[PDB]
Amino acid sequence: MIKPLGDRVVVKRIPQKGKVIAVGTGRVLENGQRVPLEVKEGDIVVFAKYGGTEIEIDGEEYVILSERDLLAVLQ
Amino acid sequence: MIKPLGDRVVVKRIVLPDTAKEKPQKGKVIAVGTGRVLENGQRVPLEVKEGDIVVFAKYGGTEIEIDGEEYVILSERDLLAVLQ
Amino acid sequence: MIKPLGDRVVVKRIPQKGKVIAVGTGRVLENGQRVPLEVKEGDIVVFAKYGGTEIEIDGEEYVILSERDLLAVLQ
Amino acid sequence: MIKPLGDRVVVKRIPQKGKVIAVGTGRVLENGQRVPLEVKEGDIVVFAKYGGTEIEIDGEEYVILSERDLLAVLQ
Amino acid sequence: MIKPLGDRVVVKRIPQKGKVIAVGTGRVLENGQRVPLEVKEGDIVVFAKYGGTEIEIDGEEYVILSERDLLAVLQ
Amino acid sequence: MIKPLGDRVVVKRIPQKGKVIAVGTGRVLENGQRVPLEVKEGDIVVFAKYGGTEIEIDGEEYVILSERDLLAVLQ
Amino acid sequence: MIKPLGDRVVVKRIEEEPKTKGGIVPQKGKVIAVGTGRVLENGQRVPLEVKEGDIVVFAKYGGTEIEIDGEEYVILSERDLLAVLQ
């Protein structure tokens, strides 16, 4: 469906709480290695207010966020 | 036709409140660059390919018109996600 | 409960004093290595006033702070 | 004639279109490696409006631009 | 007592003059390497006015400071 | 006379044109390597207008420019 | 006396010569102390390119003013030193 690029994730909104519905491939380091995102689909994350980009698709609103904007996972 | 350089791509873009347009953009990738080069000489290829439908920051990238057709050159960092 | 992401920790507030209750996995370096946080659960850390993110859950308050915001440990 | 220095090129004007007439030796990396420019002479490049340094030589108008300002090659 | 974290030090006040009474583990480089502080306990340092964090403990006042805020050592 | 430091050169003015009369030792890379300046004494270089630092000494005027400010060589 | 830390130097400023058009109409300074230099990501420490005695030219307004014993000095970073006058 939605494939976030790089070090990003797609979350359905609910400090902010959102449900991780899609995760990117993560950040690339200078040595070429690709660091995997630290959150998986399903996870409820807390992110910075006003952080990320709002994106409406099929009446559904999501928020694309960068891993660095993800504060914690609520579990 | 239009060969994007480096870490870029070329996409063909795709009552109520008027501010209902200040939302994201969808485009079709029609050309992709060679991507970014790292301090160790390695070249990281773009993550998108021709055909992909990407979403990108509104007002982002550069508008270029050729033969009456409009295209948008965007850096890989401006591509939010691919819609598939 | 609250899993801090990356180079962060979760503290219970007590300059600001707080008790560390959860610690992230630490910062990732360009060479791929992961640097552990320099604090552990139980530690009483000192952080900059107005620093961090206030989060509330079930009436309890917590502060999500990143390592760079941790000035010192009182021990 | 004009010899662009480093990660630069000289282009005769025509978003801006210009024709590459001279290329530099390219950018130097922190590992001493030198990355050649991605365009060659004769190439028609597109570059950021108001970007680069305008230089007139013998009633002629060129623009000295650095590779990071070259968006694409029109071919 | 007060354990400075990372690239910091705790000085007791006397541009500002203070006595280093505790030093941190220093800054971590992108290759993992850890750079020790360039001052040691006892050093009288000159530091940026309004720089660092004031912390009082048992009627005593201290200043937590980053290595970058330490101008020089008076000796 | 005037020894440019690091990644710099000293030119005598004439987009600005100037004759390179003194060259610095160049930029030091994170790997310890020292990349030499691309220009040499004698070279007429072209640099942005308002760029560089104007220095007067014994009535004679000069300009100190860092390598990143040297756009190209005229020859 | 003063030991600059890191990539710094302590210079005593020098007042420029007065201009006279009948009446009397960038900085210079003497390096008096130099730090150990900048450190690189590979651990290496790059020595400062100036030494004590050197007269250096530096950005006007650049640096930190520190008075010490009625004497004024300027604490500067190596990157702020344009050139040596010799």
State the SS3 of B9-54. EEEEECCCCHHHHCCCEEEEEEEECCCEECCCCCEECCCCCCCCEE
Please tell me if residue E61 touches chain C, with a CB cutoff of 8 Å: no
Which among A3, A24, A32 is the nearest to B84, CB-wise?
A: A3
CA distance F63 to F69: 11
**Contacts of A56 by beta carbon, 8 Å cutoff, 6+ apart:** A62, B23, B24
G67 CB neighbours in chain E (<8 A) are 15
CATH of residue A51's domain is 2.30.33.40
Inspect the interface and report whether the beta carbons of A29 and C25 lie closer than 8 Å.
no
Where are the extended beta strands (E) located within chain E?
A: 2-4, 8-13, 16-23, 27-28, 34-35, 44-47, 53-57, 60-66, 70-74
- Nearest Cα to F26, choosing from F35, F13, F17? F35
Within 10 angstroms of residue D15's Cβ, the number of other Cβ atoms is 15
Work out whether strand C8-13 and strand C16-23 pair parallel, antiparallel, or are unpaired.
antiparallel
CB A8 within 8 Å of CB A35: no
DSSP E7: S
Do A and G make contact via 3 or more CB pairs under 8 A? The reply is: no
Rg value, chain D, Cα: 12
CB C2 within 8 Å of CB C56: no
CB B78 within 8 Å of CB B58: no
Dihedral (CA of B47, B49, B55, B59) sign: positive
CA distance G45 to G39: 4
CA distance G38 to G6: 6
Strand partners, D18: D13, D45
A9 CB neighbours in chain C (<8 A) are none
Inspect the interface and report whether the beta carbons of F72 and D8 lie closer than 8 Å.
yes
For the residues of A41-62, what is the DSSP string, one character each? TT-EEEE-TT-SEEEEETTEEE
Please tell me if residue F35 touches chain G, with a CB cutoff of 8 Å: no
Neighbours of chain G (3+ CB pairs under 8 A): E, F
Please tell me if residue A75 touches chain C, with a CB cutoff of 8 Å: yes
Please tell me if residue F35 touches chain D, with a CB cutoff of 8 Å: yes
Ramachandran assignment for A12, one of left (phi > 0), alpha (psi -120 to 50 degrees), beta (any other): beta
Do F and G make contact via 3 or more CB pairs under 8 A? The reply is: yes
Residue of F nearest to G81 (CA): F5
H-type alpha helices, E23-73: none
Strand partners, D44: D19, D74
Which among C29, C68, C72 is the nearest to E64, CB-wise?
A: C72
H-helix or E-strand containing G64?
A: strand G64-68
Picking from C29, C34, C71, C73 by the largest number of E CB atoms within 10 A of its own CB, the best residue to mutate is C71
Question: Which tokens belong to D26?
Answer: 């390219």
Range of the domain at B80: 1-84
As a 3-state breakdown, chain D gives helix, strand, coil percent values, each rounded to 5, of 5, 55, 45
Number of folded domains that form chain B: 1
Strand partners, C37: none
C-alpha distances in Å from residue F17, one per residue of F43, F47, F63, F69: 10, 7, 11, 12
Please tell me if residue F2 touches chain G, with a CB cutoff of 8 Å: yes
Dihedral (CA of G47, G52, G57, G58) sign: positive
C-alpha distances in Å from residue D47, one per residue of A13, D72, F73: 39, 7, 22
CA distance C16 to C50: 9
Question: Which tokens belong to F55?
Answer: 């220095």
Work out whether strand G81-85 and strand G38-39 pair parallel, antiparallel, or are unpaired.
unpaired
Which among D30, D38, D48 is the nearest to B6, CB-wise?
A: D38
Neighbours of chain D (3+ CB pairs under 8 A): B, F
Residue B21: φ, ψ to 5°: -115, -15
Residue B67: φ, ψ to 5°: 60, 35
Chain D and chain F share a number of CB contacts under 8 A equal to 49
Picking from G14, G19, G78, G82 by the largest number of F CB atoms within 10 A of its own CB, the best residue to mutate is G82
For the residues of C24-70, what is the DSSP string, one character each? ---EEPTTS-EEPPS--TT-EEEE-TT-SEEEEETTEEEEEEEGGGE
C-alpha distances in Å from residue A11, one per residue of A60, A62, B52: 11, 6, 21
Burial class (CB in 10 A: 0-12, 13-18, 19+), B37: middle
C-alpha distances in Å from residue E9, one per residue of C15, C27, C72, E67, G76: 16, 21, 9, 7, 22
Do E and G make contact via 3 or more CB pairs under 8 A? The reply is: yes
- Nearest Cα to A10, choosing from C56, B55, B23? B55
Q: What is the layout of strands, in order, in the sheet containing D2-4? A: D2-4, F70-74, F44-47, F16-23, F8-13, F60-66, F53-57
- Nearest Cα to F62, choosing from F9, F4, F3, F13? F13
Please tell me if residue E75 touches chain C, with a CB cutoff of 8 Å: no
CB D23 within 8 Å of CB D1: no
Strand partners, E23: E9
CA distance D44 to D12: 10
C-alpha distances in Å from residue G75, one per residue of A1, B17, F4, G47, G68: 58, 57, 20, 17, 12
Separation of first and last alpha carbons in chain E = 26
CB D53 within 8 Å of CB D47: no
What residue type is C29 in one-letter code? Answer: L
Q: What is the dihedral of CA C51, C56, C60, C66, to 10 degrees?
A: -30
C-alpha distances in Å from residue B48, one per residue of A6, A34, B1, B83: 10, 16, 19, 11
Largest CA distance in chain A: 41
Within 10 angstroms of residue F18's Cβ, the number of other Cβ atoms is 21
- Minimal CA separation from F61 to chain D, in Å: 24
C29 CB neighbours in chain A (<8 A) are 29
Residue of C nearest to E34 (CA): C35
